[PDB]
RNA sequence: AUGCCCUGACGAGUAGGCAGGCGUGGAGGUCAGUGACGAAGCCUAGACCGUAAGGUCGGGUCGAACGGCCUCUAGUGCAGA
RNA sequence: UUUUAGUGGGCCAUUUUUGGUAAGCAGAACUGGCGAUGCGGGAUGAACCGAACGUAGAGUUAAGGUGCCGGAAUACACGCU
């Protein structure tokens, strides 16, 4: 298990979708701020979407922590994985997406031997 | 780290004001007045009850 | 203002060098509190004398209670009021057990029958009418007849439930 | 069209103040002005030379220069969002001394005098002015002064 | 809501660090930050603030200005501290015995100071031999002697040097600059 | 087309954004417009005083 | 030889000396308050028995509360509210009564409720909402030593020394009152009374002089 | 030690300014980085991190290249014309 | 102290005003506002009342309300219609 952290409070779990991304396919869901002179979203009329602002930011004790309680670390190989040896209560190894399956077996074996929690121990496994 | 109100919290009311113990022991907040019997003048009562 | 109180207010007009010991003017004021009473005191002294609150002082304010609060009394009230088009002097009779009760009834009555506000009304005089047949108004005179008794027909009983099971009655 | 001459809107400012027309009395010409004295500006309408502009009526300034018949006056004038120093060349009939600088100088002399009698004995004499204070407790007698007043008055027209 | 009198979130308007990425100047700032916090000498605070300053806010101090400051009464044996460059001066022929602590010395300035028997010192050696700024004399070069300051506040009746590329007759000596052609200024 | 000729509206609020400045007086003002004969004699009265305080201390 | 056992004990002895002084100061202040109020009651009684009228000394302290918010204030009342440090609604400040400040209180009259505070309200205000101004930074009181560290030059040693200097307007009222941060009061817990606040109290609203009813108001807001 | 910690106050915003960041093509350096045991791309009301720009992972499809960090550079970010 | 952006069409309200029979008309003065600004109330509304806004929680309020739509007394009281 990880360190004793306080209960993680996210303040806004919901994705900040762009205005009218539901309405037009050409308007992607990626957040864009309205720069319109008569934009009800920009003028913050009641009943409209929330805008991302700094008050929603996470408490710095729990920020970047997963629900497990570990900061994630992207790992390509055994040498990258062993830079987390003394940090197994603060860090969990993410295996990179482009690692081949036979190297994933080696990384998972080393991380089980070292006690490193792995967030994705199931990619590219013949299961 | 945390402001404790005096007039609640008797411990903070004794940290401030060491006379808060003596005030309570002599009770000093419900003490009897001297019982004098001074009477107002007839000119006062006449003016008070005047039309 | 549901409980008016009556106050004697004595004010002075502050002693200068030419006049030590000035003349000590006194008023009876109906007000909710002593602040309104002193305010009304300076309001009426700036109408009678050449004085104002900056050049005068209050030397006394006392609440006058009713001498017999549980004796029924007939009062004549002389009142000056502003209408929407002028100023009128008015005499009314009010039957209560107290002067401030009579004055509260007067203010409610003046607001009801004349749409006169508190700011438009001067109480010129409240006097207990000492003898019967000095009572001028016949809405007061009907309550001074001998062995007076009346019923209250159509008694409406207050219900605390929404639904009633009985089809109620207004007997009395 | 419009009109913005030197003496525009000066119909009443440079008028000569009922039953005080004619010649200027001579103490006006025998007052002595030193550099640094604080003077008031009020233009005499009967002398047209050395005459201040209408802006400077009622303005109070400092003598910086003394000449044959005239003194120069520093006046602060609010031009936009700042103050500019203006130098004026005014004859002495448009000039009088400020009585405020009299009153403050006798207060300076009084302060020095009471500080001397505090140095003689009794230090901390408390020699600043104070604003008007709330009055203390009185006892008001009712001796030939029984409080007797009537009520508000009925309305009568008296026309 | 609040009726704010001052502007909210207002930075001080003062450098609290040098804008340069000089590692050695950061080491000097670390040392003098420590001294200015733990010593309560006003010299150390003044030197830290002067270490933050920009290039035109640290003009060079000439050795003739150093020698003139050393000709003050009681200031002959003081350590002259220049937070900035010390330049040479060929217009002075006598140079006194001195200890000068500076950031930089030019080659001529270093040669003149050590040829007069004196010593050229850095700010860390100044901090070691004078941790409280004992027996020091801070010297600053002339700020408004710069060429840019000539053109500052250009306007009528200012006498403040128009921004001009070529200078002579035919370059702004006519209408607006003499009574004969129009008006003067 | 016809428009708004003139108004002094908002001008005092703009002047109080930086809050109308007094002109920062100094000891020793300039001799601008001070009488030239007084200035000429003031030059020599200060020359002689510089020499008098030079000889007083040396 | 760090001398913890004797440094702590010498500091404790100094603490007990300071607490003895604070105890005798507060006993003296309690006797002073009691004899002042009983002498005013007996002066009223003796004047009535002599047929005179005892006129009380006019009040020297008011407590002012800003009761109107931030928007749409004319500039001269806005300046005077900043000068009395009433920069937000339900801010409170003790004010020494002079002519020079009774004409400030006439300018800000439609925006504030004021009146004459009693010892009970000054005591409860300073114990519950009392904050100092110390490099400025709004420090809660909660200790007599931090009061003494800024007001000990004026002979103000404790929180009741501060309360006494406020209520009896002493020579260092200006320093004791500017040291207190403006009181950040709540809304009144029972309400304002008065269905409409922004009339005069004489006319059935809230603003102006409500001479001794300010005690009830501020106790509801505190 | 543009680190860590303590204390206090504050937070509206068009036009506009300034800051700190996110992303794209290419360049120098590095991770002796990833990869036909599957690079890139693409799809995915599956997951994780970031206030957000975005980043990461899982599954499908695919078949040859492509990433992180430190810097450099610009033909570098689209809903409208 | 230097440097530089945008702006140089304004409009509404109280009070003082000019022209006009007048105007949601035209033109000034002082302040506050809208523009540039959401929130609670005025059913609705650029400007009115109240109050100006980081993200939350609890409490108390303003203005406005409390038959029902609608949260809150078909309250209490004196009359008038
Ligand atoms: Mg999120
Ligand atoms: Mg988002
Ligand atoms: Mg598109
Ligand atoms: Mg988008
Ligand atoms: Mg925009
Ligand atoms: Mg819109
Ligand atoms: Mg729109
Ligand atoms: Mg009144
Ligand atoms: Mg009627
Ligand atoms: Mg019946
Ligand atoms: Mg004219
Ligand atoms: Mg004329
Ligand atoms: Mg005149
Ligand atoms: Mg002539
Ligand atoms: Mg600098
Ligand atoms: Mg040059
Ligand atoms: Mg230049
Ligand atoms: Mg050339
Ligand atoms: Mg030439
Ligand atoms: Mg030419
Ligand atoms: Mg045309
Ligand atoms: Mg125009
Ligand atoms: Mg105007
Ligand atoms: Mg402005
Ligand atoms: Mg301006
Ligand atoms: Mg104050
Ligand atoms: Mg002060
Ligand atoms: Mg407050
Ligand atoms: Mg309640
Ligand atoms: Mg209300
Ligand atoms: Mg109101
Ligand atoms: Mg209101
Ligand atoms: Mg705030
Ligand atoms: Mg903001
Ligand atoms: Mg950022
Ligand atoms: Mg390219
Ligand atoms: Mg690239
Ligand atoms: Mg290359
Ligand atoms: Mg294969
Ligand atoms: Mg692939
Ligand atoms: Mg593809
Ligand atoms: Mg989809
Ligand atoms: Mg799949
Ligand atoms: Mg193929
Ligand atoms: Mg191929
Ligand atoms: Mg790859
Ligand atoms: Mg391109
Ligand atoms: Mg392009
Ligand atoms: Mg776009
Ligand atoms: Mg666009
Ligand atoms: Mg298109
Ligand atoms: Mg700019
Ligand atoms: Mg235009
Ligand atoms: Mg119009
Ligand atoms: Mg708009
Ligand atoms: Mg616009
Ligand atoms: Mg608004
Ligand atoms: Mg409302
Ligand atoms: Mg509404
Ligand atoms: Mg309506
Ligand atoms: Mg209003
Ligand atoms: Mg708000
Ligand atoms: Mg309901």
Give a quick precis of the structure.
The PDB classes it as ribosome. This is part of a larger assembly, with seven protein chains of seven kinds. In chain A, 14% of the residues lie in helices and 8% in strands.
- The count of β-strands of chain D is 6
Overall form of chain G? globular
Bound molecules: magnesium ion
According to DSSP, the number of beta strands of chain G is: 8
Physical arrangement of strands within the biggest beta sheet of chain G: 7-3-2-4-8
Could you state the order of secondary-structure elements of chain D as H and E? HEEEEEHE
Mind describing the biggest β-sheet of chain G?
Answer: 5 strands, mixed
The side-by-side strand order for the widest beta sheet of chain D comes to 4-3-2-1-5
Describe the oligomeric state of these chains in a short phrase.
part of a larger assembly
How many strands, what sense, and barrel or not for the largest sheet of chain D? 5 strands, antiparallel
Keywords (chain E): Cytoplasm, Isopeptide bond, Methylation, Ribonucleoprotein, Ribosomal protein, Ubl conjugation
Family (chain E): Belongs to the eukaryotic ribosomal protein eL18 family.
GO molecular function, one term (chain E): structural constituent of ribosome
InterPro entries (chain E): Ribosomal_eL18 (IPR000039), Ribosomal_eL18/eL18-A/B/_CS (IPR021132), Ribosomal_uL15/eL18 (IPR021131), Ribosomal_uL15/eL18_sf (IPR036227)
Give a description of the structure.
The structure is cut from a larger assembly and holds seven protein chains of seven kinds. In chain C, the strands form two sheets. A three-stranded antiparallel beta sheet of chain C has the order 2-1-3, sandwiched between helices. A three-stranded antiparallel beta sheet of chain C has the order 5-4-6, covered by helices on one side. Chain C has three helices and six strands. Chain C is of the alpha+beta class and 172 residues long. The two termini of chain C are 34 Å apart. Chain C folds into two domains: 3-69, Roll (Ubiquitin-like (UB roll)), CATH 3.10.20.10; 70-146, Ubiquitin-like (UB roll) (Roll), CATH 3.10.20. Helices cover 16% and strands 23% of the residues of chain D. In chain G, the strands form two sheets. A five-stranded mixed beta sheet of chain G has the order 7-3-2-4-8. In chain G, strands 5-6 form a two-stranded antiparallel sheet. Chain G starts with a helix and ends with a helix. Chain G is of the alpha+beta class and 222 residues long. Chain G has nine helices and eight strands. Chain G is globular, with a radius of gyration of 20 Å. At the B-G interface, α1, α2 and α3 of B face α1 and α5 of G. β6 of chain D pairs antiparallel with β1 of chain G, so a sheet runs across the interface. The structure holds magnesium ion (MG) (63 copies). The site of one magnesium ion has 4 residues of chain A, from loops. Chain A binds two RNA strands through β1 and α2. Chain A: GO terms for molecular function: structural constituent of ribosome.
């Amino acid at each position: 298990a990880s360190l004793p952290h306080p209960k993680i409070v996210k303040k806004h779990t919901k994705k900040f979708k762009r205005h009218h991304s539901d309405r037009y396919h050409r308007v992607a869901e990626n957040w864009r701020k309205q720069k319109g002179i008569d934009s009800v979203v920009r003028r913050r009329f009641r009943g409209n979407i929330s805008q991302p602002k700094i008050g929603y930011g996470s408490n710095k004790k729990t920020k970047f922590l997963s629900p497990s309680g570990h900061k994630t670390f992207l790992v390509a190989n055994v040498k990258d994985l062993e830079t987390l040896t003394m940090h197994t209560k603060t860090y969990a190894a993410e295996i990179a997406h482009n690692i081949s399956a036979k190297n994933r077996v080696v990384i998972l074996a080393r991380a089980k031997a070292l006690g490193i929690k792995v967030t994705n121990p199931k990619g590219r496994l013949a299961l | 780290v945390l402001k404790k109100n005096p007039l609640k919290n008797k411990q903070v009311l004794l940290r401030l004001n060491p006379y808060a113990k003596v005030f309570a022991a002599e009770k000093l907040g419900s003490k009897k007045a001297e019982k004098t019997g001074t009477k107002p003048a007839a000119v006062f009562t006449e003016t008070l009850k005047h039309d | 203002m549901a409980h008016f109180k009556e106050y004697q207010v004595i004010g002075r007009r502050l002693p200068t060098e030419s006049v030590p010991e000035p003349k000590l003017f006194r008023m009876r004021i109906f007000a909710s509190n002593e602040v309104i009473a002193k305010s009304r005191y300076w309001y009426f002294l700036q109408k009678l004398h050449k004085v104002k609150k900056a050049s005068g002082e209050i030397v006394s304010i006392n609440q006058i209670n009713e001498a017999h609060p549980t004796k029924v009394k007939n009062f004549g009230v002389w009142v000056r009021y502003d209408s929407r088009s002028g100023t009128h002097n008015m005499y009314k009779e009010i039957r209560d057990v107290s002067r401030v009760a009579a004055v509260e009834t007067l203010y409610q009555d003046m607001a009801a029958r004349h749409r006169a506000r508190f700011r438009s009304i001067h109480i010129l005089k409240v006097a207990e009418i000492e003898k019967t047949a000095d009572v001028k108004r016949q809405y007061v005179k009907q309550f001074l007849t001998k062995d007076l008794k009346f019923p209250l027909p159509h008694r409406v009983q207050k219900s605390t439930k929404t639904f009633s099971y009985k089809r109620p009655s207004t007997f009395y | 069209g419009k009109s913005h001459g030197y003496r525009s809107r000066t119909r009443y400012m440079f008028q000569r103040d009922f039953r005080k027309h004619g010649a200027v009395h001579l103490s006006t010409y025998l007052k002595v002005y030193k550099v640094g004295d604080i003077v008031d500006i009020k233009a005499n309408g009967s002398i047209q030379k050395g005459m201040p502009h209408k802006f400077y009526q009622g303005k109070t300034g400092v003598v910086y220069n003394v000449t044959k018949s005239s003194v120069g006056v520093i006046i602060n004038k609010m031009v936009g969002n700042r103050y500019l120093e203006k130098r004026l060349n005014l004859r002495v009939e448009h000039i009088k001394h400020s009585k405020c600088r009299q009153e403050f100088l006798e207060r300076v002399k009084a302060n020095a005098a009471k500080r001397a009698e505090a140095k003689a004995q009794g230090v901390a004499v408390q020699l600043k002015r104070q604003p008007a204070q709330p009055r203390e407790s009185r006892i008001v007698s009712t001796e030939g002064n029984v409080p007797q007043t009537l009520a508000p008055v009925p309305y009568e027209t008296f026309i | 809501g609040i009726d704010h009198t001052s502007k909210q979130h207002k930075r001080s308007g003062h450098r609290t660090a040098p804008k340069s990425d000089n590692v050695y100047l950061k080491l000097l700032v670390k040392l003098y930050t420590f001294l200015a916090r733990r010593t309560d000498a006003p010299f150390n605070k003044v030197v830290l603030k002067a270490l933050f300053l920009s290039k035109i806010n640290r003009p060079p101090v000439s050795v003739s200005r150093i020698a003139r400051a050393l000709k003050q009464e009681g200031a002959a044996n003081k350590t002259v501290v220049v937070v900035g460059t010390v330049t040479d001066d060929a217009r002075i022929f006598e140079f006194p015995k001195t200890t000068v602590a500076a950031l930089r010395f030019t080659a001529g300035a270093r040669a003149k100071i050590v040829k007069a028997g004196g010593e050229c010192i850095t700010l860390d050696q100044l901090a070691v031999r004078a941790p409280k700024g004992q027996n020091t004399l801070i010297l600053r070069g002339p700020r408004n002697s710069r060429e840019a300051v000539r053109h500052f506040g250009m306007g009528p009746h200012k006498g403040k040097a128009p921004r001009i590329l070529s200078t002579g007759r035919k370059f702004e000596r006519a209408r607006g600059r003499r009574r004969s052609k129009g008006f003067k200024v | 087309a016809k428009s708004k000729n003139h108004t002094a509206h908002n001008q005092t609020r703009k002047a109080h954004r930086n809050g109308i400045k007094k002109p920062k007086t100094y000891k020793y003002p300039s001799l601008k417009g001070v009488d030239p004969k007084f200035r000429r004699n003031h030059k020599h009265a200060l020359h002689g005083t510089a020499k008098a305080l030079a000889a007083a201390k040396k | 030889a760090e001398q913890v056992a004797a440094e702590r004990a010498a500091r404790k002895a100094a603490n007990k000396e300071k607490r003895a002084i604070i105890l005798e100061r507060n006993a003296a202040y309690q006797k002073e308050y009691e004899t002042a109020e009983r002498n005013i009651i007996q002066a009223k009684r003796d004047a009535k028995a002599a047929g005179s009228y005892y006129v009380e000394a006019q009040h020297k302290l008011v407590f002012v509360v800003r009761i109107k918010g931030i928007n749409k204030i004319p500039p001269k009342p806005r300046k005077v509210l900043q000068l009395l440090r009433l920069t937000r609604i339900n801010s409170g400040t003790f004010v020494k009564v002079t002519k020079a400040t009774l004409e400030l209180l006439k300018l800000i009259e439609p925006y504030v409720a004021y009146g004459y505070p009693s010892y009970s309200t000054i005591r409860q205000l300073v114990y519950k909402r009392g904050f100092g101004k110390i490099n400025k930074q709004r420090v809660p009181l909660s200790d007599n030593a931090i009061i003494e560290a800024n007001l000990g030059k004026y002979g103000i040693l404790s929180i009741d020394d501060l309360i006494h200097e406020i209520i009896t307007v002493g020579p260092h009222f200006k320093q004791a009152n500017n040291f207190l941060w403006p009181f950040k009061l709540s809304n009144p817990s029972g309400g304002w009374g008065v269905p409409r606040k922004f009339k005069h109290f004489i006319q059935g609203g809230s603003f102006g002089n409500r001479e001794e009813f300010i005690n009830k108001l501020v106790k509801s807001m505190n």
